């Protein structure tokens, strides 16, 4: 008999929770940032070298974006919209293994589908950073870290 009121309060409370999330996302997207599945992304307007871009991303409480899933890869290459963007792709260690600067473990197995066919070709033996280039799932290219490009920052949505 009273179970009705309890349930109303409940829907209202869940409604409240969703309004809170949308609001938080809106305040951020309102400031020229993008948003996708738990993360905020910034697509720069000015080109930088890989490291200056990273340094910039850090100054905005984020990192050059990592890619952790196929849906994220697809969001990135689609939002990139034909323009080329530095991402968190960079060689580290004494092995020249690829890595994410934000320290996401690099998924070798899954990443295979994310490279432009033929890349990374390490041209000139001087291509130790990665960018998003092609308008396809197979989007990544290795390029010299000192070349300037637009870049993409990423930081997690946190209540």
The sign of the dihedral angle between the CA atoms of 18, 21, 25, 28 is: positive
Closest CA to 49 of 145, 125, 129, 123: 145
Mark 92-121 with x for binding to Ca ion (rule: CB under 5 A) and - for no binding: ---------------------------x-x
Q: Does an H or E element contain 156, and which?
A: strand 150-156
Q: Are 102 and 53 in contact (CB under 8 A)?
A: no
Alpha-helix runs per DSSP H in 45-137: 50-59, 70-80, 108-111
Task: Using the minimum distance from each CB to a copy of itself, give the nearer residue, 14 or 122.
Answer: 14
Please choose which of a copy of itself, Ca ion, none residue 141 contacts, taking the beta carbon within 5 to 8 angstroms, the exact cut-off set by kind. Ca ion
The footprint of a copy of itself (CB under 8 A) covers 1-2, 4-5, 8-9, 11-13, 15-16, 18-19, 22-23, 25-27, 29-32, 34-36, 43-46, 48, 56, 59-60, 75, 78-79, 81-83, 135
Q: Kindly state the smallest distance separating residue 11's Cβ from a copy of itself, in Å.
A: 6
What part of residues 128-147 is at the interface with Ca ion (CB under 5 A)? Answer: 141-142
> Residues 6 or more apart from 112 whose CB is under 8 A from it?
none
Q: Kindly state the smallest distance separating residue 83's Cβ from a copy of itself, in Å.
A: 5
Q: Kindly state the smallest distance separating residue 5's Cβ from a copy of itself, in Å.
A: 6
């Amino acid at each position: 008999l009273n179970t009705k009121i309890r349930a109303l309060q409940g829907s209202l409370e869940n409604m409240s929770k969703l309004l809170k999330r949308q609001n938080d996302i809106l305040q951020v997207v309102s400031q020229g940032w993008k948003y996708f599945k738990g993360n905020f992304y910034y697509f720069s307007l000015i080109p930088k070298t890989w490291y200056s871009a990273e340094q910039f991303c850090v100054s905005r409480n984020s990192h050059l974006t990592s890619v952790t899933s196929e849906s994220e890869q697809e969001f990135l290459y689609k939002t990139a919209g034909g323009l080329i963007y530095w991402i968190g792709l960079t060689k580290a260690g004494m092995e020249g293994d690829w890595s994410w600067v934000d320290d996401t473990p690099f998924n070798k197995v899954q990443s295979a589908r994310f490279w432009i066919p033929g890349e990374p070709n390490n041209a000139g033996n001087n291509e130790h950073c990665g960018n998003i280039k092609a308008p396809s799932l197979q989007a990544w290219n290795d390029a010299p870290c000192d070349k300037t490009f637009l870049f993409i920052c990423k930081r997690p949505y946190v209540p």
